[PDB]
């Protein structure tokens, strides 16, 4: 039984996937039209198995997929998930330096400012929603600061980011939870806006600037094409928005749920970094996981997988694998989290890992330092986002009494 859209699954998928993981390393998911890998070692292996491709054009349903949401056709083919291996490496080699911990450190001040202003704006009420009043307003500001886009454009870009991430699932994953017209509008509006931002930066290039750097790469030799560049910036916005919102929300939730964990991070603020990694290890935000496609017929974990068939890596399951993490069903902010696959492995490893950790460190660190007695008002509400165990609301009382 695998029903990742069943009511309750997002809130707590662990009993259901544990049953799966213990019974089998692999199964075919009817509605998902793909194989599903449940165990750490098989999941981890596939990340680094060149037999399994990332490009959706290797899928048996590629035609149906490329035709869906034609406004995103360029992003699908020239984006990081679509480029051929040689081109993918080129693009990553080009942008990776811009995302190191050192490079993104400069954003520290602006992120703190945003976090400060969100807390000042709303901390006074009876009720505070860690999603809508806090987490939701942080990640795009971070990305926009990195892109040197005015705070005025934040809301429109966040809408683009969140819409794009869902739209990319249409025809690929089972149940995208929104009206197509609305999705396409936000995507169109966002791409237009992005075009304007890029044209302006071409007009006024800047020093030590990611976009300027990309634009110069595009102008000079053959290091980056216009479509690759647009697909890259679009993907950065779409990949880095909702993911980070849920990290922040899940972090606060999990620290409210473990007084012992919270107490350790209060005692040793230096543990926050490890705690945030353990949030994704213990309670991974992905509903199912990520996908790969078989480039040829092969046998795997006792299954006969055919060329072009999709495979889902069941991340929240692999990350509860007891052969890899001891006491895997315990949230332990002191554990070694090195083996967590939350940010991927191999050439496609998430470039935003440092930016995400920084944003969450500032956001989660600040809220608990400023309101150390914060308490859950009532059970968080979860939704049916096709990719995420999305928290819709996380209502708290900042200073209870
Ligand atoms: C906040 C928590 C985040 C998580 C849990 C996360 C997770 C992941 C994972 C698992 C992958 C690999 C998917 C695969 O291999 O199929 C990935 C890739 C990617 N991530 Fe993140 N990410 C996060 C934040 C960010 C941020 C903040 C950005 C941008 C600022 C970002 C940009 C990207 C991009 C562009 C890719 C595609 C990489 C490639 O295919 O070469 N992510 N992310
Ligand atoms: C938009 C995007 C990445 C990207 C880079 S280049 C390109 C095109 N897209 C982000 C990545 C994000 O870090 C994770 C969870 C990537 C999550 C990994 C996989 C790819 C997703 O869960 C996948 C099956 C999905 O459910 C959909 C709905 C298709 C995704 O949009 C979810 C989604 O939001 O994907």
From Swiss-Prot:
Substrate binds at residues 165, 289. Pfam families: p450. SUPFAM superfamilies: Cytochrome P450. Transmembrane segments: none annotated. Pathway: Secondary metabolite biosynthesis; epothilone biosynthesis. GO terms for molecular function: heme binding; iron ion binding; monooxygenase activity; oxidoreductase activity, acting on paired donors, with incorporation or reduction of molecular oxygen. Its cofactor is heme. GO terms for biological process: epothilone biosynthetic process. It catalyses: epothilone C + 2 reduced [2Fe-2S]-[ferredoxin] + O2 + 2 H(+) = epothilone A + 2 oxidized [2Fe-2S]-[ferredoxin] + H2O; epothilone D + 2 reduced [2Fe-2S]-[ferredoxin] + O2 + 2 H(+) = epothilone B + 2 oxidized [2Fe-2S]-[ferredoxin] + H2O. It is an enzyme of class 1 (oxidoreductase). Heme binds at residue 350. This is Epothilone C/D epoxidase. It comes from Sorangium cellulosum (Polyangium cellulosum). The lineage of its organism: Bacteria, Pseudomonadati, Myxococcota, Polyangia, Polyangiales.
